[PDB]
Every structure is written in structure tokens, then in C-alpha cells.
Design a protein around this ligand. Structure first.
Ligand SMILES: [Zn+2]
Ligand SMILES: [Zn+2]
Ligand SMILES: [Zn+2]
Ligand SMILES: [Zn+2]
Ligand SMILES: [Zn+2]
Ligand SMILES: [Zn+2]
Lengths: 254, 255, 255, 254, 255, 255
């Protein structure tokens, strides 16, 4: 695979040196869109672009999306500081799109977990937009010690039983220190027309976070990319699970 | 007894302060968990806890479950607002369990009317799930005045005779404005294995609302807490009554 | 949302202009066909079409099916008059199908009240076909004043108390003046093959009017779209409700 | 994380330099047991040993067992050649044991996929010992071109539709070129005595391969280590899965 | 017709050589898959394939399904042995499907006795699953001689009168030595939707063995192939017969 | 495997020597207790104990329960005689429980024939208690010769054709000489709560003898161990079999 601190620097180069098939730089100018009056919090990275410039890195994102994204997101944090003297901007998302292979929803499940994939389908329903605790800061009300606990949006709220410093159980969730974002679930499946006659269509549930919330309605034809997650479904004599797609990038199909 | 305002205070306290013998802030943690992405709509409260922390209040929810349960629900809403800055959060139920006495169905008398009881028995039947109007919003077709009327699932629907404001006798219940929850009847009785030979087992009908509907099938042995109600027999106009159990909490025995 | 006058415009547009990916003017062609010697009394509209052409309007018929369906039917009548010089043509239904979400019977909650839903399931029962008064014409025996009163098949008959004009309390429903259509109840439920072991299948009653009556027998598996209604349980005066599905479109699954 | 070619060399050092808390080398002599009249095909590596000598590597095995093992197995292949002039020995397994944390069976499922874990429980049943195609060699009967396809024991036999060289569909599985091993499933759960009164015990199914087949009978109390795998269970409207434990090392509890 | 030895040759060929219009070696691939860790115990053979590759043989399995089916099973066993060096592999069934003609239950006559037919209909009933002795091993209590006797699930058990070797009339069936498979009866009939008004639907009983037992529930519409049997009515000693369908292959219609 | 003489030795050992993790001589203590004024007629043996002490023997009682159970019962009789000088003591059963695998009723196949299995399920039915002849003493009316014939409760009564000694064909079963024990049938099945939706629960009939008769009523959930038997369906002369569970040990789940 590839060293983590190295991907960071390898992405910075992509972000800078790249220019498309007409000889025009592009990611320099996407980064500037982060500093308008109404900024964005996301940088859409074409993967065909990243592969034609750095094939060995592009195949590492897919193989390890969790690290691959986290890396590219540090490389954006840097380039904003080195090429634009900014360290005030805060969290920026790196959303990859236009991957090599496009799955139909039915083809997922056969697919492997924790790997970046691309799916095309139709949205059948979307949830209530609700606040998600993405970072929980617990506080000992006895000694004062703070404890940070990061959260996965596909697992319930994880907490801490006792204070790691003084051993006290008298802890509370500090809502102010903690970090919240928007959350919105949705469900896609394969469009009836792309299936055979007596073929039951299949579905998968997704998670949208922060700034890609409220991006879609039912009936929308879409192309999402994200990471599959295995989630508990029922704790039977032996547990069964399902697969949900934590979305990294979504756009409508044209 | 205790007035509402004060019960709510006493409850909000219990929730925040109570700790078990190990020092876990049980009810703080449960309320904390309502901030999870897919929360419960109930908070179960061990009566023995409430009793050890505020015995007068604990004995008060048995005597006046309707008040106590309501107070405890308002307390929860307060803690969510005050200690977690959560507002939009919906109704959260306070369900009490583990009362000091467990009755057999044959022991449930009309003296227990409108108090909280705890019964053990086996489910004989379970009704079909239907919607029930917890909150009926009526609307005048003339002035468009909106009158809110709460209902009880064991009493008949309470309509309005005439508009309270414009005086019009032309009001209907507005379905879109009103609030509904799931409803499901069920029946428990004493198992024959617990009775004298020859003894006819006694039963009682209950009601399950909202998030405890469809929690039991026939053949299940359960422990329920609930407010006993005695309602006039609809069957006739005679002075014979019918015991109904409005369930507050239900769990299966041995789990 | 959209006011009636404007929906009708937006609909008439859709009908005339919409074309599929191949360029066929689907709804023009269907309306054209109403000029055949033995026409249909309905025009089925693929929701996904309406959505791709006028998404705001499409999401509007789900939110307010009663309005949307009514608007679309007025639009059809317009196109027949304007583009085909056809007047006498009777009522033509607008039946929407292929909604984005398909519910199981067990998922149909009272939150869906008065919205359009799409359900899949198996027909358990089918009622006897009877006449229903879509339009009740009442007539005063004194002045001969005629009062028109529309009805809903899931509500009780709305009569008139007294003559609106001469004030007489002597009016009867005139059968010859009134309009009737076929009516037929039916029931669908989830197939056990789709539930957890031990799970009791849930069901729901529906209503078929006019030209979709007698379209299904028991055993059929179907997909219906319809406006969910929640009506007070006639069984009693209690606050318990009953879900009824007023079917807008029905087709068998897989065909 | 760590570079792959590097773990190899890092393991070779462990295998050589290590000596226990009494000052005696150990893995030098385990490797010689591979060259007796009746050799072994496995080297049991204590993890407490690997952690006390190379903490950063030991935590990488657990985090990436698939690579971590494959690495340590190359490092054994080497050390047999460099310190014992042998490249004839063939496939040797690296089986890690005595990990930091021991799960009860019930605690699995909550556990993460593709990570080395350790479980204690009791065997309730064991399967028929049967031959598993671990490496499938397909052959084009037209041009002659060979195609190698490696197999996962928790997924059905994977094949190839057509010849990658000449495009022909006239392919056959060459049983002689292909590689087979023993396979035997089994099932463990938590011992009734370590559970509460009205507590339904939970189970998990395991896979034993090659030389660790037939190692256990029902009733045996055991400590296995392995990698969890998510497997399809039923292709419902949305697919459900289960978790099975591909075993890396098994021994009875004393 | 064809003798057994030669059918097996012709079948082994078909399996190995057959390719579809795209060039896929269908039956090679299916047999290849029996080497997977959890294999099937059947190989389904499209009759239309066999027909296009060896028409005389194909028409032979309809005329003599018992022979053909047996030959095809021996062929499979050969290919596994010869081309995959697999021996221990158990019995593998050859199940034929997609025959040229599909009968309605009302068309199945006794002329079809002992031939292969293909029927479409709806499952009315499904029996309880029971064990059936495919291979009865008898054992003499005196000499310990072992006599193997195959059985048919539609005929009565064929015992042995006396030991074939030591002549002893003291033999019993040995259960441990014998082979059993699952058995399950079922019944199909024509759907009334396919008959004249007033017509009484006709039915027929079938048998499912081994790995096709418990494949259908009532209400399922299916297409089955099977050997028709006509057995004397056990009901009496009269000369009236009963049609039974010994199913070779079953799949649901429309899938 | 192990011959009878040697199993008995190995068993007698286990009984005497076995100790748990705390050092209690469990089976010594149980056998000691048979000297109490009102003893049991059974000694329950935890399989996991026998397995930890003599694994080969333990796996042997599963493979050959009839032998193993019989051997263990002879061992008990020995220990009572040798270590307690007790002779007159009647038959004492050896009932094994807590086997390594627990089957669902649907998993019990004829491969388990004549082995020991452990099943979990719910009692659907319980038969009437009747007497069964464990030991049939037949008596010749001419010479007065006595022939002992043991019986199995799942097979038909084995009589004697003619007197073994005087050759007379005139023998009857002597009731006073014979031994009887209580007999009771029962039936268990899988609970629907444990099956796929739509799945028909499977069941199995069992037999309780002597001191475990009348131990369960319908509705009880139980864990049984027993020797599976497959007996020919008496219903007919067909080759279809019937699974019957000859219960060795039964206890209710969770207690
Ligand atoms: Zn602290
Ligand atoms: Zn008013
Ligand atoms: Zn008038
Ligand atoms: Zn080739
Ligand atoms: Zn003989
Ligand atoms: Zn005699």
C-alpha cells in the first residue's frame, strides 16, 4: 500500500500540478471557491483526474477510503495555508467522484465492505434532517477532565463509563464542546425499467452528512459514491447484519 | 400529596442526581442516549430507585399515576431542554416498573381504581393494531376556530357541542391537525397452574399505546404496570363495571 | 404549494407536451384514443413521467392527492375540449401509478392520512359490487328546489336538513337525478412469506369505484396507489380509528 | 500503518533476535521443527512475544491480519533459505496466538470485520472434513493459456467466463494444476455456565483449513484466533449477512 | 430405443460438449461447480438443450424417463470421476425441465402413464415432511446376510419373504444400514380462472423427494415435470386407478 | 468403540471418582442419596462431566445410547452393591443431559437414527398416561414354561409363536408376572417466533416412560435428550417413515 504522511504530500501535488485534457488547471480554482462570501465545505475530486496523474494513489483511495479521504483532507488543509495563508477555514470535505466501475444496487452486497464504490439508482425515500453527534465531548464533573470520543454515524452514540483521570463515574455530555452536524438517511434501489419481468428490485440505505444533506428527493436518479458499512440488524441466535452506504459524494445522473 | 409544579422539580432532580450503588448516573445516561441518531421514545424508571431517592414521590406515583407519570414526562422534557439544549424532541414516555407488590389477575379489585398496579400473568389474546387519537383537534367550519381536546382510549370520544368562540354548532374533527398513536388491546389471565383445582381462571383486558404496542403475542408470560380503570359496562345501562388495565410498562417475566 | 387554477394549467401542459425518451407524446396519444368508438374512462399517468416534467407538481399530488387528481381530471376535460372539440365526453379519471415508494401494509401509518401512498400486497377478500351515490341530488317537495351534494364512499351520507332556498324541512334524495357508480370493497395484507416467523400479518381495507371495480379476486397480488383515509371506528364512540385505502390505481404485480 | 516489504524484514528480525523472559531463543528452534521427519507446516507465534519485541508491528498484525500474516509467512520462507539453505519446504503457516483481548462469543458481531481477534468458547459441532479448492487453475482448451484464480474459503468457487488471451469460452478446471486443502467447519458458542439465567447463548461458525483440520471435537473448550468475515445469508429485499470466523490459530483452554 | 450403456455414453457427451448459442459450456460449468465447498445435489437440464444436441436421446427421456433419468445420473458420476477425479461425491439428481408441451391438470390422462409430463397449476396442499427409504437394506438375524432392495415412494414397501442365501424366514429391515431421504406430498390443480364457468377444477397429487421437498407452499403457481404414475386405488379392491405425479423438476411459473 | 463389560467398568469409575471444579464428588453424593427413605429412581448425568473425565466414553453414549445408557445403569447397580451393600434396590435410570449440540425440531433428520440427540422446543400435546409392558413374561399353559421378552414402546408387541421348551403353540402373556411402567406420548415443535415468515412449524412425537411421565403440559418449553427412532409408518405399507423421540432426559428451558 502507501505511507499515510506520504499520501498527504502526494495529494498536495495533485491539487497543484494537475491540468485537464485542455491544459487548464482546475483544483487550484476549486480551492479558491472555499473562500467566497458563501463558501463551500467540499472539494469535488474527479478520480479519472487523480488516476491519470497518479495511478498508484487513486487505487489506494478505493482500497483504503477511510485513510485515503482523511489524507486528501489534510492536504487541502495545508494547501490553504501554504498557497493561501489560511488556517481558519476549518473542516473541508474531500469527495471523490467518477470512479472506474459503477454498480447497480443489486450488485452491492456481493461487494466488499470498507472500500470506496460507486452506485447508480433511484431514490425511493429520504429521511428527516436531524442533528448527529459526530464528536462527543464528555466531562468529569468532579475533577474537570475532558474526554473526546468520536462517533460513527452508522452506530449508536458511544460514551465513556468513567473518567480516565480520576476514575469517577460522574460524567456528563457537554453539548457545547461536542460537535454536531446534519444527518439525513435515504434509500436507493434499481429502477424497475432496468430489471427483468419477475425481478424484485433491491435496495440499500445511505447516510448523508453535513453539507450533502437535503441534496435529493424521492424520484431522483442519482450516482453516489461511498463506503459500505456492515451494521447489526437483529441479534438472533447468531447475529445478522445489513449493508449501508455511508455517502462520500452524490450528484444526479444527467 | 404534592402539587404538579413541585413534582416536576422533584422528578428533574431524581433524573439528574440519582446514582445506583456503583455510582452510575443511570437516568442521566438514559436521557443522554436520547441524543443518539435513533433514540427511544421512552425512559423506563425503576420504582425502587425513585423510592430510595425520594420515597414520598415514589408512593405518590402509585397513588396518582396519572399526575406522577405526567410530571415525570415534563421533567424529562425540561432536562433535555436545560441540560442538552434539545427542543424539537417529541413526547417521551415515563414508564415505571418494578413496583413493590405483584398482583395476580384474581386480586385486582375496584379498590385499585385509578391507582398504579403491577400484574403478572399470561397473554391470552392480542388485538389488531389500530390508530387512536391521543389529541383531537376540532375545527369550526365558519370561523376556523381550533379547539384541542385530549382523549382517553377507554372512554368514548369527546367531541365539542358548539364552537367555544364564534358559538357555531358546526365543528368537525380535523384529522390532519390531530395526533394519532398506535393502539392495541390485549388480555391476560392467571395460569391454571397457579390456581386451586377446579378454579376458573380470571382475566383482564388491557391497552397498549404508542411504542409498546405489538410487544407481546399470546402465550407470553408478562409483568405489566398500569393504571387500573373501571369503566361502566358498554354492554348495557346496568350498574356493573368492567376492569381495564391502561398499561404503563410491560416486560416479559424472566428477562 | 399550488392553487387549483394553476395546477390545471401545469397539468394540461404535461399532457400535451410530455414525451418519453423515444419522443412519443404518450399522454397526447392516450387522450387522442378517447375518440375511439369504445374508449376508456381513465387515463393512467406514470408518476415518474410527471415528475421528470414538473417535479413540483408531481410532489404536490402526493401531498394533496384529492386536489391534484381533481386538477388533472379538469385538465383532461380541457384538452378534449380545446384540442379535439369534444364536449359531451363523460368524466375521465386520472389514475397515478408508479410512485417512488412502495409500502408494506404494516408500514401504513396514520401520518400518511390524506396523502397518496403505494402499497404492495395480496388480496384476502373482495366484496360484493354495489351502487354508490357519487353525486346526490336532493329535491324539495314544496318548491322543487334542487340541491347537489357530493359524497365520499368512506363517510356517511350527507343529507340536507332543510331547503336552502324556500326553507322547507321537507326534502328527499331524488334517485333519478342523482349519479351512481359501482362500488366494491376489498382487503389486502402482507404475505406471511415476507414477515418474521410468528408475525401476525397486518391488513387494510380499500375501496374501488367505477371502472376499477371487479378488477381483482382473492389470491391476486397487487400494487395499488390510493389516498389513505382514517375514519372513526363506527364499531363504537371510542377514539379509535380505522385505516381505509381509497384506491386511485391498481395493477397486478409483475405484468 | 507499515510498508509491506518492510514487515517481512521486521519479522525476520523477530524470528531471529527474540529470546523469552529466561534469555532463551525460541523461534529459531520452532523453525527447525519444520524440517523433522514428520514436519509441521505451521509456526505458532506468541503475540505477547512479538509485542514485547516490536510493539508497532504487533499492532499492525491485528489491524491488518490479511497482510500481516502473509508478510510473516514470507519472512519464514526467507529465514529457511538464509539461515537453513532451503527453498523446497513450500507453504508454511504463521499462526498468531495469545492476543491482548479475549472475546466471549456474544461479544463478536459487535466486533469489526477483517481484524484479528481472539475468542474463547465451546465447540458445539464440527463438520465433515472435505476438500477445498484454494487455488483454481483454469485452462483454455483452444489456445492452451492458463489462468490462476485464488479462492476464499468462505465464498463459493470463483471461476473465469472466458480466456483472457484468446477470448474463448471453452475453458476447463484443471484439477491437477489446481491446489486443494482440507476444510472443516465448526461452531462455537458461550458455555451455558458463563451466562445468566434467561440468557440465550450465541454462536458463531468457523472455518479450519489445511493442517488445523480435525483438531477439535464437540464439547471441547477452546481459544481460537482468526479474522471475521461477513458472508451472505439471504438475498432479501435488502440482503442480510452473517459473520464467520476464518481461524488462524486454535488450541484448547487448559 | 437406446440401451442403458449407450445412453450413458450419449449423456456424458452432451454434458461435456454441449454449448449454448453464446458458446458457454453450460453443463461442464455446472458440474465444475459441484467442487465448490457447499454444492448442489442436482443438475438441472434444459430439455431443449438436450434436444438440440441429441434429439433421439431427448425424445427418449420423455418416453422412458425412468431409464433416461437414471442414465443421466450415471453419466454425471462418470464425468465427476473422469474429468475431476472426484469419487466420494454422493448421488446427484438429473432434473429435466422445459419440455415441449405443458399440460393442464385436466389433460393428464392415463395414456401418459410412465412417461414424463410437464404440468402447470397452483398448489392446493402440501404435506408434512417425512423420511422415505430410498434404499432398504434387509438383514438376516441368523446368517447376517445383507439383501439390498430399492423402493418406490408410491408403491408399498417391498420386504423379503426369506433369506436369499441361508434360506431363513427370519429377516428384518436394518434401519442404520438403509438410506433415507425427505419425502413430501403435495397437490396441484387448475386455477378456476382457466376453466369454463361452472367447471369443477381437477387436481393431482404429487411427490417430492430429497432436495426438492419443501420448495413450495399452497397458493404457489408452479411448473413441474415428472413421471406420471397410475396406481391402483388403495381405497378399495376395485379396478379404479389413481394418478400420482413423481416430480422430477419443479420451478415457480414466471421466474 | 467399547464392549459392554468395559463400558460398565469405565462408568463405575466415573461415578465414584468424578469431581467438579470445587472438588464435590457429585455422582457419589447422588448415589449416596439413594439410601434416603424416599429416593429417586434416576440419576441425571451431565454429559459435559462424563466428557471431561472420559471423553471416549462420552462420545460413545451419543453414538450408541442404547448400550451406553444400559452400561451406566449396570454400573450404578454395581456401586450400590459394592460401596453401599444395597441389593434389593430397583431399576435406576441413567439420564444424560446437557449434550454439546441442541437441535431444532426441523433439524432432526433420519441420519440421527438410533443416536442420542438433544432438542429444544415447545410442547404442543401430551397424551393420556397408560401402562406399558417393559418386560413381558409369557407362560405356557401346558408345561408352565416361562419365557421373558423385553419390549420397546415404539414397536409392536413381540409375542412368542410356540413354547421354546415343550414346543407347545399354547402360550399367553401372564400379566401378573410381567412388569409395567407408565407411558405417555407427547409432541414438541419449533416455536413460530424462531422461523422465517410463512414457515410451517415442524414437530415430532416422543415417548416418556416411568418416572418422567406427566412432567410436562402443553405450552411448556423444554429441552429433551433422547434416542431418535425411525419407525415404519403404521398408516400404510408404503416405504415412508416416522420419527419418534424416545426420551432419556427432559427439563424445562431456563430453570
Ligand atoms: Zn475525573
Ligand atoms: Zn367558530
Ligand atoms: Zn323548498
Ligand atoms: Zn485461449
Ligand atoms: Zn440368512
Ligand atoms: Zn410348554
Amino acid at each position: 500500500s502507501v505511507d499515510r504522511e506520504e499520501m498527504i504530500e502526494r495529494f498536495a501535488n495533485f491539487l497543484r500540478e494537475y491540468t485537464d485534457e485542455d491544459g487548464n488547471p482546475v483544483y487550484r480554482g476549486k480551492i479558491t471557491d472555499l473562500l467566497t462570501i458563501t463558501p463551500k465545505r467540499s472539494v469535488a475530486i474527479d478520480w479519472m483526474h487523480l488516476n491519470s496523474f497518479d495511478s498508484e494513489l487513486a487505487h489506494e483511495v478505493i482500497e483504503n477510503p477511510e485513510e485515503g479521504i482523511s489524507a486528501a483532507e489534510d492536504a487541502i488543509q495545508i494547501v490553504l495555508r501554504e498557497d493561501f495563508q489560511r488556517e481558519d477555514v476549518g473542516k473541508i470535505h474531500a469527495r471523490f467522484y467518477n470512479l472506474p466501475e459503477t454498480l447497480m444496487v443489486k450488485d452491492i452486497g456481493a461487494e466488499h465492505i470498507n472500500k470506496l464504490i460507486q452506485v447508480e439508482g433511484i431514490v425511493t425515500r429520504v429521511g428527516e434532517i436531524k442533528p448527529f453527534v459526530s464528536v462527543a465531548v464528555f466531562v468529569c464533573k468532579d475533577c474537570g477532565h475532558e474526554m473526546i470520543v468520536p462517533q460513527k454515524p452508522y452506530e449508536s452514540l458511544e460514551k465513556v463509563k468513567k473518567c480516565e483521570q480520576c476514575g469517577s463515574k460522574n460524567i456528563e455530555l457537554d453539548v457545547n464542546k461536542s460537535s454536531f452536524v446534519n444527518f439525513q438517511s435515504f434509500r436507493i434501489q434499481d429502477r424497475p425499467e432496468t430489471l427483468k419481468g419477475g425481478e424484485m428490485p433491491r435496495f440499500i440505505d445511505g447516510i448523508l452528512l453535513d453539507d450533502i444533506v437535503d441534496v435529493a428527493l424521492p424520484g431522483d436518479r442519482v450516482i453516489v459514491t461511498g463506503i459500505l458499512r456492515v451494521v447489526l440488524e437483529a441479534a438472533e441466535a447468531t447475529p445478522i447484519f445489513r449493508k449501508i452506504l455511508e455517502v462520500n459524494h452524490i450528484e444526479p445522473v444527467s
